[PDB]
Enzyme design. Structure first.
Site, PDB file in Angstrom:
ATOM      1  N   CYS A  83       4.807   1.345   9.225  1.00 33.77           N
ATOM      2  CA  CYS A  83       4.456  -0.392   8.104  1.00 33.77           C
ATOM      3  C   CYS A  83       5.778  -0.476   7.664  1.00 33.77           C
ATOM      4  O   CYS A  83       6.746   0.328   7.949  1.00 33.77           O
ATOM      5  CB  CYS A  83       3.366   0.180   7.465  1.00 33.77           C
ATOM      6  SG  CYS A  83       1.449   0.256   7.785  1.00 33.77           S
TER       7      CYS A  83
ATOM      8  N   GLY B 165       2.967   5.640   9.630  1.00 36.22           N
ATOM      9  CA  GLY B 165       5.342   5.074   9.602  1.00 36.22           C
ATOM     10  C   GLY B 165       4.773   4.371   9.606  1.00 36.22           C
ATOM     11  O   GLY B 165       6.953   4.211   9.427  1.00 36.22           O
TER      12      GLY B 165
ATOM     13  N   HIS C  31       0.812  -0.936   0.209  1.00 40.10           N
ATOM     14  CA  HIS C  31       0.125  -0.390  -0.130  1.00 40.10           C
ATOM     15  C   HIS C  31       0.685   1.474  -0.237  1.00 40.10           C
ATOM     16  O   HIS C  31       0.303   2.057   0.031  1.00 40.10           O
ATOM     17  CB  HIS C  31      -1.015   0.201   1.479  1.00 40.10           C
ATOM     18  CG  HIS C  31      -0.537  -0.026   2.122  1.00 40.10           C
ATOM     19  ND1 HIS C  31      -0.493  -0.899   3.248  1.00 40.10           N
ATOM     20  CD2 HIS C  31      -0.366   1.438   3.069  1.00 40.10           C
ATOM     21  CE1 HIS C  31       0.591  -0.420   4.537  1.00 40.10           C
ATOM     22  NE2 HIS C  31       0.139   1.014   4.264  1.00 40.10           N
TER      23      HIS C  31
HETATM   24  C1  LIG Z   1       1.372   1.870   7.880  1.00 37.88           C
HETATM   25  O1  LIG Z   1       1.407   2.552   6.525  1.00 37.88           O
HETATM   26  C2  LIG Z   1       0.008   2.856   8.976  1.00 37.88           C
HETATM   27  C3  LIG Z   1       0.312   2.278  10.415  1.00 37.88           C
HETATM   28  C4  LIG Z   1      -1.072   2.265  10.722  1.00 37.88           C
HETATM   29  C5  LIG Z   1      -0.771   4.263  10.949  1.00 37.88           C
HETATM   30  C6  LIG Z   1      -1.294   4.634  12.630  1.00 37.88           C
HETATM   31  N1  LIG Z   1      -0.796   3.152  13.124  1.00 37.88           N
HETATM   32  C7  LIG Z   1      -1.129   2.245  12.326  1.00 37.88           C
HETATM   33  O2  LIG Z   1      -0.651   0.583  12.656  1.00 37.88           O
HETATM   34  N2  LIG Z   1      -0.618   2.153   7.872  1.00 37.88           N
HETATM   35  C8  LIG Z   1      -2.223   2.414   7.508  1.00 37.88           C
HETATM   36  O3  LIG Z   1      -2.005   3.400   7.763  1.00 37.88           O
HETATM   37  C9  LIG Z   1      -3.296   1.881   6.731  1.00 37.88           C
HETATM   38  C10 LIG Z   1      -3.129   1.178   5.993  1.00 37.88           C
HETATM   39  C11 LIG Z   1      -4.149   0.359   4.783  1.00 37.88           C
HETATM   40  C12 LIG Z   1      -3.917   1.082   3.196  1.00 37.88           C
HETATM   41  C13 LIG Z   1      -4.269  -0.996   4.961  1.00 37.88           C
HETATM   42  N3  LIG Z   1      -4.748   2.262   7.801  1.00 37.88           N
HETATM   43  C14 LIG Z   1      -4.451   2.502   8.696  1.00 37.88           C
HETATM   44  O4  LIG Z   1      -3.665   1.739   9.900  1.00 37.88           O
HETATM   45  O5  LIG Z   1      -6.246   2.558   9.922  1.00 37.88           O
HETATM   46  C15 LIG Z   1      -7.031   1.581   9.466  1.00 37.88           C
HETATM   47  C16 LIG Z   1      -8.524   2.362   8.852  1.00 37.88           C
HETATM   48  C17 LIG Z   1      -9.243   2.957   7.909  1.00 37.88           C
HETATM   49  C18 LIG Z   1     -10.403   3.523   7.806  1.00 37.88           C
HETATM   50  C19 LIG Z   1     -11.365   3.458   9.542  1.00 37.88           C
HETATM   51  F1  LIG Z   1     -12.665   4.311   9.547  1.00 37.88           F
HETATM   52  C20 LIG Z   1     -10.618   3.145  10.654  1.00 37.88           C
HETATM   53  C21 LIG Z   1      -9.548   2.723  10.373  1.00 37.88           C
END
Ligand SMILES: *[C@@H](O)[C@H](C[C@@H]1CCNC1=O)NC(=O)[C@H](CC(C)C)NC(=O)OCc1ccc(F)cc1
Ligand SMILES: *[C@@H](O)[C@H](C[C@@H]1CCNC1=O)NC(=O)[C@H](CC(C)C)NC(=O)OCc1ccc(F)cc1
Lengths: 297, 297
Positions: free
Chosen positions: A142, A140, A38
């Site tokens: 990820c 960040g 992603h």
């Molecule tokens: C790394 O890119 C990041 C780590 C996340 C961010 C904050 N804590 C973490 O463990 N991952 C994401 O941002 C991730 C990417 C998607 C495209 C798979 N999305 C996420 O963590 O949030 C999910 C979410 C989506 C919609 C919603 F309404 C609530 C939560």
């Protein structure tokens, strides 16, 4: 004390990977960088990304891989499930002996949380029965990986991708397959109902005894099945015979039959701790495996 | 969660030091190796050693220092308090930027548990107000160190020497000065009764507020002296000026003055929780410094 593997062998594999305005971490083994796919997404993509369609439109040069004070040139890219493999023109000399493994729920591993390719901390986690993990992961993080170290060999078992609305976390093995029914789209996703890892709770009770703490014990006993009936009533994993076998060493080291400790744990589930604590904790801890306990005692 | 710093920079500094059959770990920084002086003690010498007389009898060539299986020839030796400084003929190429710091009670730090010079585990420790740590140390762990990493720089703060009757642990800074009233003799020694780390409890309350959990905030405030006199009555530590200072950022982040949070905590001590939880716990955690709170937020 909950204990993680020394993280140095993983630290030397962590690089920063950027595509567009997205920056996360990659794992640099030999001449391949692994990272979450992603990274190639934007906002207008996050909700329903047709990843095959987004990847073919990308060029080797849209990927800025930075290892420390140095850029690594990408000379190819491929996708395996939810992980993106970027081939680079350099090999990581610090590559350790490694393997890729998929762990079972109730197994534990250390996590090297990373931001912009720089290690920030390490801690110990377990694959919950509902295939989430309760980590400390921020924006960040990820690409951060989980791992175990047997002898000189690093068994990578996890890569971080997302935080669920409840605050637990979801991710994939290093073949890109998610743990659990989660998907790498920006949608709010609930997990199955979690349960407690009973064989780990028993291992941890044994540990409190080894450390001279036996207040929770009792003179009673239970059959395995009767214990599992109560265990499941309280949303605790069932105990298998292999689980009992695995607990043998601790049973021996302490002269406390496994089924006796099951009777203790049964009393604790029906009575509570009523103020008291075990190994400092007021909750029954279930992220120590029997193997974790043994090695440390 | 308890989260350790990444350990690789400290792994690159661990060696083993052997006198006769007595092997512990030492710390190799540039061309000096630091270790506990009781390495020169036979098991029997430890009951009440004469370190100066035991040292006069020693020469450089009595000291086996090994990184892995590779011997580092010792070219000089001296004793600084309870630690041994061995001059070696090779500068450590893996030497990080580093400093020797003496931490105050309450501060946290990661510990790299080592045996025969090989890392086995990393975990987070708090220096208790009685100058013990509730570590996880076995025979052969002496010379394991505790450290914080500030940017590029490793601040070494602890070297392990002994386990006390009560099972807790004690050691020195890297100038060989013990933390608290202990000595490196195999004699009965007792740590003062422990107390609760108030600054860290306060950091924890700030953390609960940052996460929206703020029921316990009251409308009152207090003086530092009044709070100190009251807190001691519940076997909480008194606050120092330095404690107030390192709570500054969390006070700024939440807009809640330190002495307002002290009044809110005073109320919790006097009136109790009323079965309420804070951050999903009726117990107040005291092993998270204000620094750790930020690192995870
Ligand atoms: C790394 O890119 C990041 C780590 C996340 C961010 C904050 N804590 C973490 O463990 N991952 C994401 O941002 C991730 C990417 C998607 C495209 C798979 N999305 C996420 O963590 O949030 C999910 C979410 C989506 C919609 C919603 F309404 C609530 C939560
Ligand atoms: C390192 O040499 C060792 C670490 C101890 C051993 C068990 N757990 C630890 O943290 N230190 C010592 O053995 C020390 C040496 C003298 C000169 C201070 N003595 C000591 O710690 O005695 C107490 C003890 C308790 C339990 C046990 F199994 C062994 C020793």
């Amino acid at each position: 004390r909950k204990m993680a593997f020394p993280s140095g062998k993983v630290e030397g594999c962590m690089v920063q990977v950027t595509c567009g305005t997205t920056t996360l971490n990659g794992l640099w083994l030999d001449d391949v960088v692994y990272c979450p796919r992603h990274v190639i997404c934007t906002s207008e993509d996050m909700l329903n990304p047709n990843y095959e369609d987004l990847l073919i439109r990308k060029s080797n040069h849209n990927f800025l891989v930075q290892a420390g004070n140095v850029q690594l040139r990408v000379i190819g890219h491929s996708m395996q499930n939810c992980v993106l493999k970027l081939k680079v023109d350099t090999a990581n000399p610090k590559t350790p002996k490694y393997k890729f493994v998929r762990i079972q729920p109730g197994q534990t591993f250390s996590v090297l949380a990373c931001y912009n390719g720089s290690p920030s901390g390490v801690y110990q986690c377990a694959m919950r029965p509902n295939f989430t993990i309760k980590g400390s992961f921020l924006n960040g993080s990820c690409g951060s990986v989980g791992f175990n170290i047997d002898y000189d060999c690093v068994s990578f078992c996890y890569m971080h991708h997302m935080e669920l609305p409840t605050g637990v976390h979801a991710g994939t093995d290093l073949e890109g397959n998610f743990y659990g029914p989660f998907v790498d789209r920006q949608t709010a996703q609930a997990a199955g109902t979690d349960t407690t890892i009973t064989v780990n709770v028993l291992a941890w009770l044994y540990a409190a005894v080894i450390n001279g703490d036996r207040w929770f014990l009792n003179r009673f006993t239970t059959t395995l099945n009767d214990f599992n009936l109560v265990a499941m009533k309280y949303n605790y994993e069932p105990l298998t015979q292999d689980h009992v076998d695995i607990l043998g060493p601790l049973s021996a080291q302490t002269g406390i039959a496994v089924l006796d400790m099951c009777a203790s744990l049964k009393e604790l589930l029906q009575n509570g701790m009523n103020g008291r604590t075990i190994l400092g904790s007021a909750l029954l801890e279930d992220e120590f495996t029997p193997f974790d306990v043994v090695r440390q005692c």
